Amino acid sequence: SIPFTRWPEEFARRYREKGYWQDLPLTDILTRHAASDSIAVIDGERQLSYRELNQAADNLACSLRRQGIKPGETALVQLGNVAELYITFFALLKLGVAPVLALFSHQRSELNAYASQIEPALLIADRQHALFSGDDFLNTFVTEHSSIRVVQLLNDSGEHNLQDAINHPAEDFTATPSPADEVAYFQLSGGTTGTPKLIPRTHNDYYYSVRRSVEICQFTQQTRYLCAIPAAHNYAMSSPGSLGVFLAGGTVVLAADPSATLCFPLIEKHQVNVTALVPPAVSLWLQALIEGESRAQLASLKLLQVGGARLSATLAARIPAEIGCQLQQVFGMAEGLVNYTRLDDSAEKIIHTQGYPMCPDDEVWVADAEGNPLPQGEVGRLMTRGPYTFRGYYKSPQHNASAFDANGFYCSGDLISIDPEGYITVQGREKDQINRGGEKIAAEEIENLLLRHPAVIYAALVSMEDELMGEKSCAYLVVKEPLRAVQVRRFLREQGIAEFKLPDRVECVDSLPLTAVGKVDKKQLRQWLASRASSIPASKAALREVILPLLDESDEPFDDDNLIDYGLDSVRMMALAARWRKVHGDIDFVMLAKNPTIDAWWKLLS
Amino acid sequence: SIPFTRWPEEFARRYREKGYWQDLPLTDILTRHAASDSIAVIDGERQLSYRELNQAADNLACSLRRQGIKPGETALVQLGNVAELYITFFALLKLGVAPVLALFSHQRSELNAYASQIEPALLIADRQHALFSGDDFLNTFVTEHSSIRVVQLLNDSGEHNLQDAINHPAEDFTATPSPADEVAYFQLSGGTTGTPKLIPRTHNDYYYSVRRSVEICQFTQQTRYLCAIPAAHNYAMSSPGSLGVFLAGGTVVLAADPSATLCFPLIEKHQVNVTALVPPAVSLWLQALIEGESRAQLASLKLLQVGGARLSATLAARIPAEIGCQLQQVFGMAEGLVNYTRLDDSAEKIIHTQGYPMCPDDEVWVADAEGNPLPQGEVGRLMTRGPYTFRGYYKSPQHNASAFDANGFYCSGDLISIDPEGYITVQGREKDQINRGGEKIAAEEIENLLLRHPAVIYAALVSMEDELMGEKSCAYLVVKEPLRAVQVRRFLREQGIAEFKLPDRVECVDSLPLTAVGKVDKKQLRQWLASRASAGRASIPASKAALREVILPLLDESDEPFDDDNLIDYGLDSVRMMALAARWRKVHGDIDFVMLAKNPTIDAWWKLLSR
């Protein structure tokens, strides 16, 4: 029925024979516990039993059937980190419908994009979301995508109230999930491409993803999991994420964001033993502790998952040191292929590598530029196929052609290298995609918006280092009439895109490399940047800038003044000597101190 | 004979009977090796055998005897980290003369001070030192201390050349060291007082200090020691320091300063296995490694001594981690009493404690304010007597009265606490003394110089925190006509004092606490400051322009926002925002991330902080 790329007959056989595809519905995850009175979800003050959760799902599905939603249809769901998300998810699974779980941070243009490829018969959104405070964008939206028939809204005492359908009990309704080898729902790809590109996941492949993730991370009835990153992403969903907790009878604790202020209290209060984060939030947490939060509220936490973005060995090491729990690096994509470091792994592999695939039948090779297998120390493009990795994007034949080699191996656009032990390390990136706090940003998607501006001739979006976010977006523009970053960010916001897509820096420049096709050449530009970057002071005035912080803030010296009289201490001086010796190697401590004036030291750095 | 406070007869007996005092001259350290051809000292490109070192000393001593220096007299020596220091020391020991080894950093006022108490018959200095470049200060100096008869200078091509006397061989010459229980030389306390106070050390007590230090640190002929901190201080001299290396037949490698740039090459080139540092140099070294120095030049180094100043457990732990050798904390004073952590000690004790005394007969207690002993966990003033700890300062009866209780126990002015295991931890300080990179600075000595200035009415010197130096001097003044730090540092410099005594910060204030006696009660001064400062640590933006100052660095440098603009349009990212919310919640506890971001303008956030 729904049109996805299937697996070669031969693979569908090996995957069932090898036990990976159990041909069970994803609903079976919540169904197992249908009779349990233990707590599945804690959202704020509310707590739901598995019985209640599964019941709510039956109700909402029943109520939706009554509103004339037929199996085979698609939906568009935008819900935040709130229980109604998990309810809606299972309700839609029980009906036979395939939703797209949209990020709550998404906006006008993203939602439009999704609804156009999906042709949704159902819309579920939240009135606390800016687009849904009023019914105007709402009304405009339903008319523009005509397929939409039913609409339910969270936080609405009004007509379309979602809670009404959730609490209206069940009829002669029985579940009708789609077949195990038929599409279950759609996941969102981390953008490489301007038109948003969806990922179909069948009950079979997705369920394996979750089961095997539970085995590896040791989730059990005991697991109390804090889900503070966006709940709708594949990571906090399947890896093992909240669904993995549900399969195992554990407890999911939802939180609106991952702020130490919000989370710390919840981890102690609910005795949380595991949680998943992205590197920027780990930085935030470690610092919040140093800034006087009590390392003791976090004492119940025995496991910290970190993934979605490059995690430095420096930062990884700080986790068990300052927080005092075990680290597991998770490297996965919405398309398939999650790599974990194991819990019984050595501290060497856990701090330095990204681990290895969750499946023995996950195939990974390292590829060179023409497409050739490299040995195992060598760096190249990551290729993989497998039992939970998909065979192509939904209704996107154009892109599918470039994303898969002739053998069905997907390419993530990641540069990796493999250990002699078989562990993967993320070396770099062969894609134009920016990874910002672990939110993917498609460079071309944003360039195309920039080109909608009258004064923009050529546009290029590249990543750039940030100690905290880990990467930030920087837009390089060639302009008719000069443009200021504010105006760009403002212009783009008016285009109705997610707030984190707005560039963190904008640099107008005299020219940009153009390739035969008309787009800026990213390889090039990336080179004539990273070169300029890789350093000791330029102007005598640049040397003053370096010295001043080392003296008494109280006064400023004349270039010929003795800097000791200004409070510069011999140790800071020795260091300055060391830093400058790496350029003029005759400079030592003694030489600097023999005549310590700015004049003297400038004559030396000449 | 020279006038020092002796040990009670009962103790001199126990200390000989227990083997501590061997009644041998300190020269015996160099004498043992007089026939050895192995290398005692490497100074730059020069290398001296024990035979040569001992010989040079016999020559310089003989040459000095010829110039009329009689046993019993005193000297003033100012020499840096160079071999001629060690030669001069033993030369003067062989004559029977007791020198003061002055720091090379010392200047006009310090040297005057020393020569006044000592009444030196002999002056030995270096022409590379600013005061001795020319003959100007030297002439003024000898007239103004008339006791001085002979003068020898390092790097003097002229008549006073020291090298000449060092190389002029020995006539009929025998050493006439002073008797083991008589004074050998003088050491400098950093001093708690404004007149410099000298510490007499007898051959007996000082030699013990060295022997027992060698045993504990296991120096042997294999020990190859880099002496980069000032060579004349008790630490790099006796603990075990260069003399400990000489006793053991090891090799001492001299270096002018302890910079990673100078030292790293020397440790590799000479295969140095041990060296002593102060906490600020350890920071400098650890960072130099991170900044791209190869951890491999330091590979021969099996032991790193760190002392002289508080060494944080964070820093201590980094040593074996990043440098990869063993740490030994050393907490001694020039007056006696060195505490080591042992080499076989646990990593717990080595990182957290300062170790315990090098002698079983070292006595340590702790005292509340009455002088009564505190129980075996409590914090209080450190009291000690012992076989190598002196019984009083040289010709300073006034101070001696306050530095010793009636039982002969010296008080270091340190606040310590003792482990159930008996290990000492330095808790804090009483003495009004500033410890700057581990150079002691007497607060009163500097105050009295500040009062020499016309515009200064009341003066107070206190310590202050510094991440790197560990402590810096800050001078609080009450002034007639307003003074700027530069003018103070310059004024003080002209007073002829060591460069590190110049205050790192100067604050002019409207008033200072004065006690019934007339000088700043530094005790209130210390609290008025305690609070002003700990009120501003949890401090949050004062006013709306102070809040702008905090936000701007978080946005694009490119533009500035109007108070009502949305700050996200200016590049402020949700993570930094969460953090700002956290810091502000500690004052208004209703503030979370969500609230900040609902309306992220400077106006909005100001309305929230004025509540």
Ligand SMILES: *P(=O)(O)OCC(C)(C)[C@@H](O)C(=O)NCCC(=O)NCCS[C@H](CS(=O)(=O)NC[C@H]1O[C@@H](n2cnc3c(N)ncnc32)[C@H](O)[C@@H]1O)c1ccccc1O
């Ligand atoms: P403000 O904006 O309010 O807040 C900032 C903050 C807190 C960071 C906020 O943005 C936030 O909450 N962020 C969370 C980000 C997040 O939830 N990320 C989940 C990503 S879902 C991911 C699949 S993917 O396709 O989107 N990513 C695939 C690509 O990601 C790269 N990548 C993944 N893991 C990596 C590791 N470990 N190292 C290096 N790169 C990594 C890679 O390039 C890949 O192609 C996902 C993550 C984990 C497991 C499974 C999946 O599917």
Ligand SMILES: *P(=O)(O)OCC(C)(C)[C@@H](O)C(=O)NCCC(=O)NCCS[C@H](CS(=O)(=O)NC[C@H]1O[C@@H](n2cnc3c(N)ncnc32)[C@H](O)[C@@H]1O)c1ccccc1O
């Ligand atoms: P620029 O100025 O060119 O360079 C800066 C730099 C490198 C810091 C420079 O000044 C420098 O080289 N400094 C080295 C200082 C130094 O050599 N110090 C040795 C001093 S001799 C010391 C005994 S004392 O009487 O001088 N001081 C005694 C007091 O010291 C405190 N204290 C000692 N040890 C301590 C430890 N381990 N922890 C905490 N406090 C400590 C205490 O207040 C005591 O009363 C000495 C030190 C070690 C061993 C033996 C002796 O004699």
